[PDB]
Amino acid sequence: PPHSIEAEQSVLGGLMLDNERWDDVAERVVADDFYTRPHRHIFTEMARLQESGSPIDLITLAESLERQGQLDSVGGFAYLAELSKNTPSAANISAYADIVRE
């Protein structure tokens, strides 16, 4: 299957809905593997958060990006909200993580 942005969206959104699938995703993809700037930024952020013991769900994430002035640079809360809603829970994050890797 093709790369596209939807795949990236599903990885990120999916990670927001399930902070546990992180290790799997991290072992398959890296920030710079993402097309868009927003996505690389969000990914780096989730990396920082998760590597510091903090959850990477929508509320925690949006909260940290705002306290850092970077919320606008990522697409604002509206976009993070969109990623959270658009990605169905019935998806294989590891698969998409791999699709994004190549």
CATH of 1-102, one of 1.10.260.40, 1.10.860.10, 2.60.120.460, 3.30.450.40: 1.10.860.10
Contacts of 30 (CB under 8 A, 6+ apart): 43
Experimental method: X-ray
HSE-up of residue 79 (Cα within 13 Å, Cβ side)? 14
Handedness of CA 12, 1, 24, 48 (dihedral sign): negative
| 2-to-49, 82, 95, 102 alpha-carbon distances in Å | 29, 22, 12, 9
- To 10 degrees, what angle do helices 37-51 and 58-66 make? 100
Q: What does the block give as tokens for 31?
A: 């920030």
Encoded amino acid at 26, one letter: A
- Burial code (b: 16+ CB inside 10 Å, e: under 16) for 19-37 equals bebbeebbebbeeebbeee
Given in angstroms, what resolution was this structure solved at? Answer: 2.3
